[PDB]
Amino acid sequence: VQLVESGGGLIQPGGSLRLSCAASEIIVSRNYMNWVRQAPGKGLEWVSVIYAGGSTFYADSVKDRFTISRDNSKNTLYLQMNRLRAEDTAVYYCARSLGDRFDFWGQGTLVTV
Amino acid sequence: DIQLTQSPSSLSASVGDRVTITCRASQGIPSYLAWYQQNPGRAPKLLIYAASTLQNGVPSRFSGSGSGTDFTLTISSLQSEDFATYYCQHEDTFGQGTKLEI
Amino acid sequence: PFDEVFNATRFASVYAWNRKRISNCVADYSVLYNFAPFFAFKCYGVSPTKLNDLCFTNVYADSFVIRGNEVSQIAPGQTGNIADYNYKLPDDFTGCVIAWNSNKLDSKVGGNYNYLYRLFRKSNLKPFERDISTEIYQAGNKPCNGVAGFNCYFPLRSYGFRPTYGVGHQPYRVVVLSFEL
């Protein structure tokens, strides 16, 4: 089982980036997939979620600036982040929500702004 | 907007002692509460869900109880590998976090 | 022929919501206002006061029980667990929705585990479609032949209504009326 994120890096203030979470032993088009974030020195913050039926939800504070999608053939999840702020600097985790549990977590990727 | 507050913000104990941690909600909620562990530089690890159910592979010493507005996580005996950060989460809300020391 | 729907001693679960057809009987809609008070009473495509003067070919009454906070999902164009896997309304819906609190009728100390809902499904639900399956949901092609465990879960969850829960998590009884023109 694996959920590995890639794409993070140093991006210019307000730049646009795409983060790809690749999966193995799980099927993205079947589970509830979540993007969470952690800012250094602070607790976790849930960012966005997508169901297996295609519905999407985001936190009210970051809506209309992020976009969650997927590529089913490649079993990949994608987070397009636009107009990034240093406030968006964090380590982002790709989680599988199973009811009311994040049972499987990725190692996450760092995004610096 | 339900809020979760953890206590104590930090505690220190020696090896073999009994540890108790509290997570309190702003208002009464069902027992849909989970507890996660996180070591520095590593992805968080699920520990408990439903406030009483132990996840597969979790050592049997961790326990959880409570209801209403107060829930508690208990470690009967500590070990050199039991020192990390702990979070209590309900739905889409995470707690502030708690710390443990040797 | 409304009393058997509003005053029923038992209501069905949302994942198996009840449907009743009505045709060949005059209906006094004022009787609805006698079952006061209604937490939500919202009509789309018809004026509530003018319903007594319209002779529809047939009517359908769908009844079930849900949480308070989820009541907003019963409306065209909405999304969520209820709207996606349990009960869907058409984008051109023409009918009324009534919802009222039932904390005193559907709440027990032991917790009412009779009242389930569907958690996950591989595809969305069509308008007025039903699904009462109970086979293990699957994540990954390692087959689940009816054995629970990792990636093998029974897709129903219980509401567990209890008297002490907050208004958001307290039970609500919902009746939806649809008219045929």
Side-chain angles (χ1 to χ4, degrees):
Chain A
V1 177
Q2 291 187 2
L3 309 172
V4 179
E5 295 81 336
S6 56
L10 179 65
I11 211 87
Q12 298 312 351
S16 311
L17 185 57
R18 194 183 186 190
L19 307 177
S20 68
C21 156
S24 171
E25 294 289 328
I26 69 155
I27 307 173
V28 165
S29 60
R30 297 192 192 200
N31 291 108
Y32 287 178
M33 305 305 297
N34 297 249
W35 276 107
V36 184
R37 79 186 184 192
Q38 189 177 34
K42 295 196 177 177
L44 288 161
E45 184 192 6
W46 175 77
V47 166
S48 73
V49 68
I50 185 164
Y51 299 138
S55 292
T56 67
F57 290 85
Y58 317 88
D60 288 341
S61 59
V62 305
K63 203 167 189 180
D64 295 323
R65 311 200 295 111
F66 284 17
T67 304
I68 191 165
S69 63
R70 64 192 173 193
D71 193 335
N72 303 329
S73 48
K74 304 158 187 178
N75 194 9
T76 310
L77 186 77
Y78 297 98
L79 187 68
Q80 180 74 43
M81 309 183 305
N82 306 307
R83 297 185 290 173
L84 287 163
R85 304 176 178 181
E87 303 162 30
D88 285 333
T89 281
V91 178
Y92 282 67
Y93 296 93
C94 183
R96 175 181 82 168
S97 75
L98 179 66
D100 296 341
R101 296 117 63 193
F102 299 118
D103 53 343
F104 261 109
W105 293 67
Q107 305 304 309
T109 200
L110 175 54
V111 185
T112 305
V113 199
Chain B
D1 197 1
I2 293 160
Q3 296 295 316
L4 302 168
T5 308
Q6 288 182 247
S7 177
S9 61
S10 67
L11 66 143
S12 67
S14 304
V15 179
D17 294 359
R18 186 185 243 260
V19 175
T20 318
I21 309 164
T22 53
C23 181
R24 186 176 296 182
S26 59
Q27 52 210 40
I29 57 170
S31 296
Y32 298 135
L33 185 123
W35 289 87
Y36 304 82
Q37 170 184 35
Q38 183 190 31
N39 284 309
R42 299 182 184 182
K45 180 182 171 184
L46 173 64
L47 280 183
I48 287 174
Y49 73 85
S52 55
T53 314
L54 278 164
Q55 177 60 299
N56 284 336
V58 175
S60 53
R61 58 172 181 275
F62 292 86
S63 64
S65 71
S67 59
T69 51
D70 284 290
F71 308 87
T72 286
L73 173 75
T74 299
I75 304 173
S76 54
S77 182
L78 287 183
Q79 295 187 335
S80 56
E81 59 267 36
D82 306 358
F83 307 104
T85 310
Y86 296 78
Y87 295 76
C88 59
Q89 172 256 4
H90 170 69
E91 294 182 356
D92 293 321
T93 309
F94 276 89
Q96 52 161 29
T98 297
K99 180 66 172 180
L100 182 63
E101 308 197 336
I102 200 185
Chain C
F2 288 4
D3 267 0
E4 286 184 10
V5 171
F6 279 83
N7 280 339
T9 54
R10 297 179 182 180
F11 263 50
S13 300
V14 72
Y15 88 102
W17 47 272
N18 266 339
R19 159 155 278 188
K20 190 164 183 174
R21 183 184 176 216
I22 304 172
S23 69
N24 202 1
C25 180
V26 174
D28 192 353
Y29 300 98
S30 63
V31 177
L32 305 183
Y33 301 108
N34 289 337
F35 293 125
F38 296 134
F39 179 80
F41 171 78
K42 190 166 182 178
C43 293
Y44 313 77
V46 292
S47 173
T49 60
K50 293 191 180 179
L51 288 169
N52 282 324
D53 302 334
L54 286 166
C55 196
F56 307 106
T57 313
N58 298 304
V59 180
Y60 299 99
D62 300 328
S63 56
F64 47 82
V65 170
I66 44 172
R67 271 176 187 177
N69 60 355
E70 293 174 336
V71 171
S72 59
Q73 290 191 30
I74 310 302
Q78 290 292 310
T79 60
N81 284 342
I82 302 302
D84 291 338
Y85 309 145
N86 299 271
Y87 194 79
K88 183 72 180 168
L89 287 174
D91 297 341
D92 63 349
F93 174 61
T94 305
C96 295
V97 173
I98 293 130
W100 68 95
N101 182 308
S102 63
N103 187 42
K104 292 184 182 178
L105 296 167
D106 286 295
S107 100
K108 229 278 123 163
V109 179
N112 272 1
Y113 309 121
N114 178 293
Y115 275 141
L116 312 171
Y117 66 98
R118 187 169 292 282
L119 181 48
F120 24 61
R121 183 180 175 185
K122 280 191 180 182
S123 62
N124 278 354
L125 189 75
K126 291 183 183 176
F128 293 125
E129 182 184 1
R130 287 183 76 184
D131 192 353
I132 59 168
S133 161
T134 59
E135 278 192 348
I136 277 177
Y137 185 76
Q138 169 173 332
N141 287 324
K142 297 191 180 180
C144 312
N145 74 348
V147 176
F150 258 95
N151 297 329
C152 303
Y153 327 103
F154 290 108
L156 294 180
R157 299 285 189 189
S158 168
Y159 271 120
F161 289 125
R162 291 178 182 179
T164 59
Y165 289 0
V167 178
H169 290 273
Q170 276 174 343
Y172 277 69
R173 292 187 169 191
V174 171
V175 173
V176 183
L177 301 175
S178 308
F179 314 135
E180 276 193 358
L181 290 161

